[PDB]
Amino acid sequence: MENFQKVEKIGEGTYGVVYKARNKLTGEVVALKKIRLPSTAIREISLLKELNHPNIVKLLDVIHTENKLYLVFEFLHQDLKKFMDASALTGIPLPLIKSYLFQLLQGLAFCHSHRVLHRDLKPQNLLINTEGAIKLADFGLARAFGYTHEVVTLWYRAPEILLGCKYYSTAVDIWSLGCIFAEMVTRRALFPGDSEIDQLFRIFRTLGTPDEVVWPGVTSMPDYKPSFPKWARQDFSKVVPPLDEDGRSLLSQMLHYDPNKRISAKAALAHPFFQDVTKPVPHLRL
Template sequence: MEKYEKLEKVGEGTYGKVYKAKDKETGQLVALKKTRLEMDEEGVPPTALREVSLLQMLSHSLYIVRLLCVEHVDNKHGKPLLYLVFEYLDTDLKKFIDTYRKAPNSRNLPPSLIQSFLYQLCKGVAHCHSHGVLHRDLKPQNLLIDKEKGILKIADLGLGRAFTVPLKSYTHEIVTLWYRAPEVLLGSTHYSTAVDMWSVGCIFAEMARRQALFPGDSEYQQLLHIFRLLGTPTEKNWPGVSSLRDWHVYPQWEPQGIERVVPQLEADGLDLLVKMMKFNPADRISAKAALDHPYFDSLDKSQF
């Protein structure tokens, strides 16, 4: 680790501390993620090796934060630590939206920017899904932004399986439920790529509204937020829903029409959002299909 100069701690990720650092030789800024990976006598657990090599392969996409290398260090107790070295980006989508919302002349994100960011997000998600990888925790804080280039990149990808995701993150803040798909909230054990598309829909709406679509503070409240807007799901629009593990009898709400909460979106944007927010995961649009949606027709795709 001597070749990096630690500049500041930029956060505590779910898997350990994150530092902004500089590569002393090249001057390149990097993010060092210290993982709390307990290695045994045999070295790094094979699951972690698989995750890391998967991450390295996936990070060849422009829309996924690049894993530059992995450094293996022995700490003072002789316990081996892994540092993941990522490219460094200085802002994320949550902070980016906040700059628009909190500005004195508070204004909406330009529709062309929302369109561009959503397209890049769908590109990144489609790339993961084509390799059989679910992100499972997409949220604005996990989407890093290169403001100069107007590029959005997915971070915190898929370490969940080898590094075991705690329910509370390292800093004891409760992991946010706002972007979690209803099938996950209802305890479904078999979930698919559709869980990520639900999150993408929530993020799309949040870029347009500049505030979260479903800000629940418990799993139950989270479901009520969703049901109040989209209607309480039924066996008709979501076959099998009432046999999911955590299903209860909920108040019966009628669907409100999503356009009421995102008046900023025009017809094509609204249509795409509705397709991302279908209750039945089988009905939700895929990332690959989303890229061909008419909402993106006016976008110059050659730049991507």
């Protein structure tokens, strides 16, 4: 730590608080995550150091000291939520939404081919820079270990996790990214639940209550109950206007109940939604 000069708090997570920091030594500006009070987490964390992609925030180093842990990261100036707020009156132009979705999928297709899942994608875990890039952030702090008790959002949790699946797949990240995708198009959260059952029931009211017809094995799931009310599905023509036909088709596949039929990032890269994909510069104001 004596290597670093704090600059400001940029964030706080379940895990640690995040400082903008400068190398007392090199002048290099970095982001410094502190995690408070072991062994396989170390190996885990260190396995991330290797997981480098243009669309994953780069983990520069791991300092382990006096039982405090610190991860030194590349620093980005803004997150997708703040950018999303700054766009609310007009919303993010479609070619920019498409570019972001496209880069995150490439991010995820890398993750996934290497067996790493993010587990917690959400607008504030996504960071942007002035050159049109969006990066998955704080990534694989999932199979790490466990200070504010500030509630985590459920809004992007995949239904298999809510139904108590222990062993869930890479498909949970796609569900999450599709939640974010629809949110970018609409300027409102897709499934803004405020408890687990409420989060479940909001998915049900838009997507239909899942049964064995749409999701083989649904009813044998840990947290499934037959007494779940039976909601009818809606068309996404009503869920994400005015997303075009390609976009609605893509979102649909990213929001399949059955994780195993849910589109993979790889397949998602090949979807005609991305036929005309470009990389627009965003206006940022820092």
